[PDB]
Design a protein around this ligand. Structure first.
Ligand SMILES: COC1=C(OC)C(=O)C(C/C=C(\C)CC/C=C(/C)CC/C=C(\C)CC/C=C(\C)CC/C=C(\C)CC/C=C(\C)CCC=C(C)C)=C(C)C1=O
Ligand code: HEM
Ligand code: HEM
Ligand SMILES: COC1=C(OC)C(=O)C(C/C=C(\C)CC/C=C(/C)CC/C=C(\C)CC/C=C(\C)CCC=C(C)C)=C(C)C1=O
Ligand SMILES: [Zn+2]
Lengths: 420, 487, 33, 116, 387, 116, 100
């Protein structure tokens, strides 16, 4: 009203405070007869987050579907068979919501974030968008027109360019199918090519409806009539990839050689030995990266040097992996990486958006949310013996190398693979 | 006989598109029963319950404020100080930014290494941020390590060594960054905007400061700055997460025993050095830059001005957008719609900055050279429209969006701690969500028009532009577009 | 360092305008609109 | 309905007269809709597939050549003409429905006619 | 940009050509008040058209009624004296602002490349202005109207073969009479609309390159929009001209003319002092100095040949007189000579005025003879004056 | 030649007068040569290094700003001016020589002026 | 830019680069970023260093030797003597070139 902001406004009804100690709520999960998993968890935070996670990605493209998953991300929350794109945007804006979509190599996600009082609106708009996309041609061609520009604006970021680069160079099969498709599969992508990809891949047994901040009762009341009629289809085996090692080279000039050396680490399906990869990542634009999947992962280290100093940086990095594999790590350094690892997983976990992602992430990967507690145990149980042998076993396997920029002074794959 | 409708390729293709149009004329009403595109002003305070923000004032004037969440595993603890570059002088400009650097560079009890090995052993994080009017040092740590983080914060704010060899090294780092990392063109536009809008005031000075000051900063200067500004009545200790108020208060009264006791408020320094807005512009023309970037600002409202809430609602009405946003052609913001439909900007953003006695309300835009003329028209047209025609729907939707954004951004111990610290410095209290929501709901269409007529109509503006900006209209064109002569 | 480069890199709140034709009013004075 | 030929015999003759006139030039009734007449039309035309528009553009060029030459389509070509085979009306209705939805919600128009 | 929606109304097709050519046209920021007489000339043209149209609603083009109808305007028409004085003195105002317009161009070498067509269109405009003003001065049918027309329509007789034939076809008979006055009135109504069209071509031809500036340099780096900077700069000149015009209209309405035109035309008697309007005096003094009828007409033509040939002479590459001190002083001597020629024109034919007119006509033509050689000498200035 | 300053004192006065007028604006004499005056200056100006052309444009903008303001350069700035330091005459003479060679051998010009 | 329309020539260079390490791996068609440096001053410095009389042969098929020398000798004797240098050594290795 009229008073200054330092003075309380008279006549405001104040809700009673929440207790300083609030017992966390259990994750209720319900599986439908068609195999669709609905999982929710109640929180005292007024903000709600509802996501839909699909077991689908770039590994289901090859061949004659290259680029479908990146287009599908960009065609999210567009026109559906029941409401135009204009009305959809106006419905989300009217409740102060926000929508996001993400396409990885193995997972697709669709999330809406709004106040808890708008759960029926969020669920209805979310399910309609993923279940009944119209894929109108003028909307596809606009997203296709936008997709051209982002791919062009990708070699401005050598971190991302190289991380995509070493995935296709190191794996053979589906995991080598690029997430960013080249500008030749884009002149073939159409609305009807997207509808065939989605009708065959977006099945109820490959979906998870995960919500953070809702009651499981009414969330079932709204979601069941919109999802119960999905056909029950048998689960198909995931398309298998094989790590083989490889080399990426590309001379684009410049005076900043970018580099990535990478190795193979076990995937999420291997309990432990995937924790060690994150602790190893913390033990180490130059950094150490990690890209893990269900059954195989990739651990590597970046680097940025000069045109003529692009011979010793690689051996420099190749010396640090040898040192860790040789046992040249002190307990003070190991304990710092352990504490850094345990704190990071606990610090990202207070974000309501991430905790909802983690619910959908895990119920797709495993089928249940595994408590962070056993993860923390597997962290503090690590010894210098485990770190040294994990690296020794990791770096004795075939090597993956990536290089962008001036590559004239970078040596061969054999002249670098022999270092390990 | 004529060919059947599916024989010629163009006849078959027309049949395919026609059939697909037919399937859009019959929506399934299962999916059309809850969501509506008409914005409704809702009132749900039952979901607004939050843990109590307990505040305690010590006899020395220090304030400790906590919002406890004992189920959480992490906590954020830190110090917010009513001090910044505004309260410096023309000879001490840059001492606050220098002090931020040196704040983690040695103590009697701990050296530079010993401090950072300890932060790493607990897996914590130390962050320091300084602005024109606020300075903050806070720690992100686990529940079991709050007392250690408070011990560290008190140690670095009361016993810092400021060794002259460290100063000279840090002097070289600061001199380097002042002349080698200036490509952050967005913050450069706002830095020049503050300098021209608040010219000849303490608020027009940059946080980083001149090189002449930086290369003359000594041990004493950092010590005098702490003595005069880091006083107990000007600092707040805020903690959020797994923290107990009584435990934290007792740690504070044990550890903060060496603060300055100067009983000078920030209201007195501001009144002694008021900040005032001057209509002016600075144009940094460089055709070698691919993109133009400009910001256009009006003098806005201070923190405690009740019209500040209306300026937040008006800022949401203008909204923000960039090329990657998907539905920009359909949002409620008419400015975003004009930009998105006609492709006249790479990005556009409305900002509302507040200070103790003034503020800035305006729009920052990135565009190509050939889009500048049309873009400048749309920006000025949509801003000026707020004084003439405000629909009830557009103000109801901006109120709903603002209420949602202010509460969806409070996810994590960190955003809650900085909220507690910032609000205690600006309002003298943490405003309950129920009250802020009530002040937002008060901003109706008549309120927006009244506030817009006070701040926008036929008012002077400040312009800060860089890049290929020859096509940008001059000051008189922007000045004229603040009123409509057809009314 | 060139004059334009330094001016872009260092915002200057003590701007001195040309005063041969027009003298400014003191800063912090309400507008003559 | 008075406009329906199945019921009104005058509407039957109206359709027959119009159909005979279009057939002489090889034109469809939708070919008489011009993008310049209305912005809703040119928005609908842009949304149609390339093959539809190419055939329409070719039928328009063929008719203009006939009109210039003061001649009609040969009778063996007139027999295979489809004057009322539609390709534009369904799209035009959708485009107009979406414009009415924008207006009802106070949104800005997606496209505007220039002031001549 | 994609112009899906409507932006500023000025950019819409209904007003894009006015926006681009009048409102947003880039103009050198350093134009002086000397660059505001082009618009004044356009305003003077408009005033002459508007007052002339309403004066023609009361004037009779007959030798038995012309003089008395002008007296009926001054006396009986409500507001008639002002229409007549705004038109009679507006013609003098038209020539003052155009003479200053012309001399602005000579000082700053505005005729030079790339604006030779602009200067050539201006010279044609000057010829139309002289014809329009002269035949209008015959309309009142006073003593100077009749004897002024008798001379100029006789300028054709200098042609040997068909000279007499052109004079009588021009007259419509064997003497200046009603057929001459009736045809002068029709041409006096039509020529100002041609003058409007020529000024539109003149303005269009200039906008192909933009105006020259006092420094005479390339000005693309410091151009601004015509509205509102040179709109308010021109408006100051418009208001000052309105004050200047009002002083002539309301306080000295007849000092710019001669009393002899208030006597009705008498083909028998002849005024002892027959002179044109003051703005034709410099041409009239050039004609009088040559003691040969054919030579005098040749010299008058040579004036316009010299003016038309100025832009095409090979010259030095510097434009402004601010950096050409010899051409600067050469310009100030021409202006004193042009003022001298006008004064000599009003003087009768007798010593010493005959010799002074002959030297003054020589000095006028020497300007256009010495201008080209100065460029040929001046092209070597950069080589000679080295660092 | 009479236009030699070392030989003729009248040309010394002329050069001194020209240099003084140019110095008040910070202009070089070569800055008075306009690309729009002839297509040779434009060709010669296109062949000069960018930094030279960039400096010439800056002097022109500075001179235009002074002329609009009815100002001159400060005496300190005037003291460091070099009004007759050349950057264009040698290039222009080279362009004219190539143009004259093309004409003598019957070739077409490499450029021409648009008919106004 | 039109190199990618002749796959034999594109693949021939792309294996010269990938099959050698030293000087022979230097592209015969430099990348665009390597062109925004080349200028006349660079060309003169390169040409003056590498174009030496001991490194040039004037072969003329279809002329008498007397008249070839009579014209050519007074135009090339001016060139000074430069102690000959050795062509840099190049190393063949393996390698793969891939542009998806
Ligand atoms: C003492 O004595 C003297 C005076 O007395 C007091 C003076 O006052 C003056 C001053 C006078 C002047 C400077 C004016 C003289 C200059 C000119 C150009 C005269 C102005 C020109 C005329 C009067 C001639 C008018 C022209 C015509 C009638 C041309 C007619 C032709 C027309 C309209 C069209 C031609 C037709 C066709 C081609 C047929 C097809 C046409 C179609 C439209 C289809 C002098 C010198 C003088 O010594
Ligand atoms: C009715 C008569 C005339 C009208 C309405 C007129 C109008 C104009 C206008 C509006 C301009 C542009 C603005 C300005 O520079 O003032 C202009 C420029 C010019 N005019 Fe005129 N003019 C007339 C007569 C003449 C004459 C008689 C000449 C030459 C014999 C002439 C030569 C020029 C030149 C050279 C320019 C360009 C000046 C420059 O760029 O510096 N004009 N004229
Ligand atoms: C189409 C527009 C014009 C019309 C209809 C027109 C008409 C007339 C008429 C009817 C008269 C006689 C009334 C009188 O004695 O004042 C006249 C006189 C005159 N007009 Fe015009 N005129 C026009 C434009 C011009 C222009 C452009 C000029 C200047 C070049 C001009 C110069 C004169 C002069 C000098 C007189 C004689 C004034 C006098 O001595 O009384 N007129 N005109
Ligand atoms: C940057 O460039 C420009 C200038 O140079 C620096 C100018 O000086 C001016 C101002 C001067 C002008 C427009 C001179 C007037 C124009 C002409 C052609 C001279 C004579 C014009 C007459 C008599 C107008 C008669 C025409 C009419 C009435 C046409 C019908 C239209 C209507 C009734 C609305 C303008 C606008 C300009 O942009
Ligand atoms: Zn810093």
């Amino acid at each position: 009203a009229l008073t200054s902001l330092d003075m309380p406004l008279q006549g405001v009804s104040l809700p009673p405070p929440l207790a300083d100690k609030v017992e966390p709520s259990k994750l209720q999960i319900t599986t439908l007869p068609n195999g669709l998993k609905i999982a929710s968890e109640t929180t005292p935070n007024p903000a709600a987050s509802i996501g839909l996670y699909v077991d689908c990605g770039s590994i289901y493209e090859a061949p004659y579907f290259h680029g479908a998953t990146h287009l599908l991300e960009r065609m999210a929350f567009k026109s559906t068979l029941n409401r135009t794109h204009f009305r959809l945007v106006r419905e989300i804006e009217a409740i102060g919501g926000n929508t996001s979509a993400s396409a990885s190599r193995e997972q697709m996600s669709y999330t809406i974030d709004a106040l808890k009082t708008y759960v029926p609106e969020m669920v209805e708009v979310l399910i309609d968008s993923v279940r009944n996309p119209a894929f109108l041609d003028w909307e596809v061609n606009e997203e296709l027109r936008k997709m051209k520009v982002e791919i062009a604006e990708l070699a401005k970021n050598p971190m991302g360019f190289l991380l995509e680069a070493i995935h296709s160079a190191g794996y053979s099969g589906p995991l080598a199918s690029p997430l960013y498709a080249p500008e030749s599969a884009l002149d073939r992508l159409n609305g009807e090519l997207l509808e065939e990809f989605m009708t065959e891949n977006f099945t109820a047994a490959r979906m998870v409806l995960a919500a953070s901040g809702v009651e499981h009762e009414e969330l079932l009341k709204v979601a069941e009539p919109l999802t119960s009629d999905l056909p029950n289809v048998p689960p198909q085996l995931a398309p298998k990839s094989q790590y083989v090692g490889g080399d990426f080279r590309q001379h684009t000039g410049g005076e900043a050689t970018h580099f990535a050396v990478a190795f193979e680490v076990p995937g999420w399906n291997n309990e432990k030995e995937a924790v060690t990869a994150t602790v190893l990542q913390m033990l180490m634009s130059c950094t150490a990266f990690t890209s893990i999947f269900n059954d195989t992962g990739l651990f590597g280290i970046y680097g940025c040097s000069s045109p003529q100093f692009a011979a010793k940086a690689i051996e420099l990095a190749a010396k640090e992996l040898k040192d860790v594999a040789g046992g040249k790590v002190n307990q003070a350094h190991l304990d710092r990486a352990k504490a850094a690892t345990k704190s990071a997983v606990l610090m990202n976990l207070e974000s309501r958006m991430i905790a909802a992602e983690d619910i959908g992430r895990q119920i797709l990967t495993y089928g249940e949310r595994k408590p962070v507690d056993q993860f923390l145990k597997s962290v503090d149980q690590l010894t210098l013996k485990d770190i040294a042998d994990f690296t020794s076993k990791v770096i004795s396997k075939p090597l993956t190398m990536g290089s962008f920029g001036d590559v004239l002074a970078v040596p061969s794959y054999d002249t670098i693979s022999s270092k390990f | 006989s004529p060919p059947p409708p599916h024989l010629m390729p163009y006849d078959h293709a027309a049949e395919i598109i026609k059939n697909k149009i037919k399937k859009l004329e019959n929506p399934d009403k299962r999916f059309l029963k809850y969501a509506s595109p008409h914005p409704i002003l809702a009132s749900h305070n039952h979901i607004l319950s939050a843990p109590e923000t307990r505040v305690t004032t010590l006899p020395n004037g220090l304030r400790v404020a906590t919002e406890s969440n004992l189920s959480a595993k992490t906590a954020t603890v830190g110090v917010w100080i009513d001090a910044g570059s505004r309260f410096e002088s023309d000879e001490t400009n840059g001492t606050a930014h220098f002090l931020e650097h040196m704040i983690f560079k040695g103590t009697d009890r701990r050296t530079v290494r010993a401090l950072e090995e300890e932060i790493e052993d607990i897996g914590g994080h130390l962050n320091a941020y300084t602005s024109r009017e606020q300075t903050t040092y806070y720690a992100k740590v686990l529940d079991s390590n709050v007392n250690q983080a408070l011990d560290v914060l008190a140690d670095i704010l009361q016993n810092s060594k400021f060794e002259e060899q460290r100063i000279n090294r840090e002097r070289d780092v600061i001199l380097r960054e002042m002349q080698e990392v200036e490509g952050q063109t967005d913050e450069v536009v706002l830095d020049h905007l503050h300098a021209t809008a608040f010219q000849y005031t303490p608020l027009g000075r940059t946080i980083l400061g001149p090189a002449q000051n930086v290369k003359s900063i000594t041990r004493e200067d950092l010590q005098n700055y702490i003595k005069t500004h880091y006083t107990a009545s000007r600092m707040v200790i805020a903690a959020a997460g797994a923290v107990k108020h009584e435990e934290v208060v007792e740690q504070v009264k044990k550890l903060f025993t060496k603060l300055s006791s100067d009983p000078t408020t920030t209201s007195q320094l501001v009144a002694n050095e008021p900040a005032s807005f001057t209509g002016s512009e600075v144009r940094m023309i460089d055709d070698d830059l691919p993109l133009a970037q400009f910001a256009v600002a009006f003098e806005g409202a201070s923190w405690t001005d009740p019209d500040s809430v209306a300026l937040m609602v008006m800022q949401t009405m203008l909204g923000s957008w960039n090329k990657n946003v998907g539905g920009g052609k359909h949002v409620g913001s008419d400015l975003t719609q004009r930009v998105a439909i006609n492709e006249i900007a790479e990005s556009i953003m409305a900002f509302n900055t507040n200070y103790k006695d003034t503020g800035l309300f305006g729009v920052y835009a990135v565009a190509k050279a050939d889009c500048l003329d049309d873009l400048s028209y749309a920006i000025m047209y949509e801003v000026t429209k707020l004084a003439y025609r405000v629909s009830d729907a557009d103000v109801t939707r901006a109120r709903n969006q603002l209420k949602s954004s202010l509460l969806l951004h409070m996810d994590g111990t960190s955003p809650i701690a900085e909220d507690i610290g910032r609000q205690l410095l600006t309002y003298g209290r943490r405003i309950p969500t129920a009250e802020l929501f009530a002040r937002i709901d008060a901003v109706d269409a008549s309120t927006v028009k009244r506030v817009a007529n006070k701040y926008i109509y036929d008012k002077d503006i400040a312009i800060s532009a860089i890049g290929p900006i020859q096509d940008l209209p001059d000051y008189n064109k922007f000045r004229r577009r603040t009123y409509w002569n057809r009314y | 360092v060139p004059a334009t480069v330094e001016a872009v890199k260092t915002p200057n709140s003590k701007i001195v305008y040309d005063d041969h034709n027009h003298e400014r009013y003191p800063p912090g004075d309400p507008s003559k609109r | 309905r008075l406009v329906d030929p199945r019921k009104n015999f005058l509407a039957r003759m109206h359709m027959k007269s119009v159909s005979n006139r279009l057939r002489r030039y090889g034109l469809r009734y939708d070919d008489l809709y011009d993008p310049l007449y209305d912005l809703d039309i040119k928005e609908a035309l842009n949304r149609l597939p390339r093959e539809i528009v190419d055939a329409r553009n070719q039928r328009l060029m063929r008719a203009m050549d006939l009109s210039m030459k003061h001649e009609y389509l040969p009778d063996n070509l007139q027999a295979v003409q489809t004057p009322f085979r539609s390709y534009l009306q369904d799209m035009l209705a959708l485009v107009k429905r979406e414009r009415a939805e924008r207006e009802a919600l106070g949104a800005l128009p997606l496209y505007q006619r220039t002031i001549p | 940009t994609i112009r899906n929606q409507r932006f500023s109304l000025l950019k819409q097709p209904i007003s894009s050509t006015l926006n681009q050519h009048l409102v947003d046209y880039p103009t050198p920021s350093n134009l002086s008040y000397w660059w505001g007489f082009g618009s004044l000339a356009g305003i003077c043209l408009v005033i002459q058209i508007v007052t002339g149209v309403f004066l023609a609603m009361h004037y009779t083009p007959h030798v038995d009624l012309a003089f008395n109808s002008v007296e009926h305007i001054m006396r009986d028409v409500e507001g008639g004296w002002l229409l007549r004085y705004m038109h009679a003195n507006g013609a003098s105002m038209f020539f003052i602002v155009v003479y200053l317009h012309i001399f602005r161009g000579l000082y700053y070498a505005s005729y030079s490349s790339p604006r030779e067509f602009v200067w050539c269109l201006g010279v044609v405009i000057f010829l139309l202005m002289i014809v329009t003003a002269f035949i209008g001065y015959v309309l009142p049918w006073g003593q100077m109207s009749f004897w002024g027309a008798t001379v100029i329509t006789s300028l054709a007789s200098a042609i040997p073969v068909v000279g007499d034939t052109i004079v009588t076809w021009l007259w419509g008979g064997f003497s200046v009479d009603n057929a001459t006055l009736n045809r002068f009135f029709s041409l006096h109504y039509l020529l100002p609309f041609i003058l409007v069209g020529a000024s539109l071509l003149h303005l269009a031809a200039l906008h192909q390159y933009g105006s020259n500036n006092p420094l005479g340099v390339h000005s693309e780096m410091d151009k601004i929009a015509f509205y509102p900077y040179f709109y308010v700069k021109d408006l100051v000149g418009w208001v000052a001209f309105a004050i200047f015009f009002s002083i002539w209209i309301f306080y000295a309405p007849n000092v710019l003319g001669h009393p002899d035109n208030y006597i009705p035309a008498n083909p028998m008697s002849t005024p002892p002092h027959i002179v044109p309007e003051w703005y034709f005096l410099p041409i009239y003094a050039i004609l009088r100095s040559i003691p040969d009828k054919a030579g005098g007409v040749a010299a008058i033509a040579l004036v316009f040949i010299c003016l038309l040939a100025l832009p095409f002479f090979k010259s030095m590459y510097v434009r402004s007189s601010s950096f050409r001190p010899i051409y600067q002083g050469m310009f100030w001597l021409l202006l004193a000579d042009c003022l001298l020629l006008g004064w000599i024109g009003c003087q009768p034919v007798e010593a010493p005025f005959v010799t002074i007119g002959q030297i003054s006509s020589l000095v006028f033509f020497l300007f256009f003879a010495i201008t080209p050689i100065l460029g040929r000498v001046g092209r070597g200035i950069p080589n000679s004056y080295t660092d």
